[PDB]
Structure 1
Amino acid sequence: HHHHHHMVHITLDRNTANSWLIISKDRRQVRMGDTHQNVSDNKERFSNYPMVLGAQRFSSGKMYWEVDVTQKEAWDLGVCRDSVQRKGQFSLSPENGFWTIWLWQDSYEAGTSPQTTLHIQVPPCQIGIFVDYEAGVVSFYNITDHGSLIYTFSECVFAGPLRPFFNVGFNYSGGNAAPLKLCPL
């Protein structure tokens, strides 16, 4: 792929974070804390899952960014509507405003309804995410495997502004503490 030149500088929005997340000073890394992080509740915070949004909102154009997932056992990445539900239980699907892939229990899947099996020969340490707003496309790339395509959502019906979306995952196993990191341009 030749999407690198649409690179955008993404930062995390503290105000949207689940109350157990720890966002770095530069707003480029997030990890699961071992407890509540001593913040007030607000209507923007994801309550049920270890999720956070990017600060940037996109309503046009082509955008590209990269995320480091090294040594994590579980995570979700992609984009979502600015108006997605924050409280209670929900599935990651385009019907609910999410265009995502994930790792869970040693398998990679795209957040369709129902979910789609991904075929990845080289487990990725960094994921590239490409959004073409006008075309209705979200694509995922394996940076560890020379940029190979992972998955394309096409005919997307965004139906509003988009925000970068992250889930660091739970750490019940003690093997998923590592952060998600936004990689330098």
Structure 2
Amino acid sequence: VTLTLDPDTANPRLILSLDLKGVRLGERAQDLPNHPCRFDTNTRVLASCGFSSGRHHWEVEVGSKDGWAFGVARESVRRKGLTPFTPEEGVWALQLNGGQYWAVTSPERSPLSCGHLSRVRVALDLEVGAVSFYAVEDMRHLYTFRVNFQERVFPLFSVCSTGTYLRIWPGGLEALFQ
């Protein structure tokens, strides 16, 4: 079965698509049951399935404008209260913010060298300890985080502004410097 988004993790301001494969930010909080896995402040949602071993691919269709971040998270990522969006919190992600694409390193983010992004392939390797991101149009390498994950790892999605979105699929300006 393909990955879907887990409604029990979803921040109540998010709207998950009917097919549970897309996420955007709504204008009001839904009245959802309190759940210990639910992100109650940060605008995050996990996939239905997490991985403790092996190699795993999925793809992410990304909105053209600011507000999204996605990647993977350790299962122990904190759900309760306002939390930082940083590798220290067990989140390893790409982000579109300020009109720029970033790998969310810390304390400073790392700007990506890439064209406009539309579809990104995520390659999670729990045997080696890495998560890698590729732009599908030309298979350009965007970023690799090397991490000894040491627990179960979940696909992670976040949308903190309206006017953008993320959608999950099965696997399969640099010109300023001219």
Q: Structure 1's 100 and 54: CA in aligned 2 closer, same or farther, altered over 3 A?
A: same
Distance 1:80 1:184 in 2: 19
Alignment deviations for residues 30-55 of structure 1 (CA, whole Å, 9 cap, x no partner): 11111112322222111222110001
CA deviation vs aligned residue, 1:48-69 (integer Å, no higher than 9, x gap): 2211000111011110111111
Alpha-carbon distance, 1:153 to partner = 0.9
- How much identity, in percent, do the aligned residues show? 37
2:154 to 163, 167, 171: 163
Query: After the TM superposition, which segments of 4 or more aligned residues of structure 1 sit over 6 Å from their partners?
Result: none
Gaps of 5+ in 2: 172-178
Q: What residue number does 1:153 align with?
A: 145
Shift of 1:184: 4.5
2:48 paired with 1:55: yes
Q: Choose which of 163, 166, 169 in structure 2 pairs with 1:183.
A: 169
Partner of 2:8, secondary structure, is helix
- Distance in 2 between the 1:167 and 1:149 partners? 22
Distance 1:102 1:88 in 2: 21
Separation in structure 2 between the aligned mates of residue 179 and residue 107 of structure 1, nearest angstrom: 16
Relative to total residues, which structure has the larger strand share, 1 or 2? 2
Q: Distance in 2 between matches of 1:75 and 1:97?
A: 17
Q: Tell me the TM-score normalised to structure 1 length.
A: 0.85
| In structure 1, C-alpha distance between the alignment counterparts of 2:29 and 2:88, rounded to whole Å | 31
Partner Cα separation in structure 2 for residue 102 and residue 27 of structure 1: 21
Q: Per the alignment, in what secondary structure is the counterpart of residue 39 of structure 1?
A: coil
Say whether the 8 Å CA contact 1:92–1:112 is kept in structure 2. no
Size of the alignment, in residue pairs? Answer: 171
Unaligned runs of 5+ residues in structure 1 are: 1-7
Offset, 1:136: 0.5
CA RMSD of aligned residues (A): 1.7
- TM-fit CA distance, 1:129: 0.7
- Relative distance call for 1:129 and 1:184 in structure 2 (3 A) is closer
Distance in 2 separating the partners of 1:35 and 1:74: 17
- Taking a change above 3 Å as real, the CA distance of residues 59 and 97 of structure 1, as seen in their structure-2 partners, is same
C-alpha contact (below 8 Å) 1:16/1:52 kept by paired residues: yes
Write the distance in 2 (CA, Å) between the matches of 1:13 and 1:37. Answer: 15
Deviations 1:85-104 (A, max 9, x none): 01122222332211111111
Contact 1:109 1:115 in 2 (8 A): no
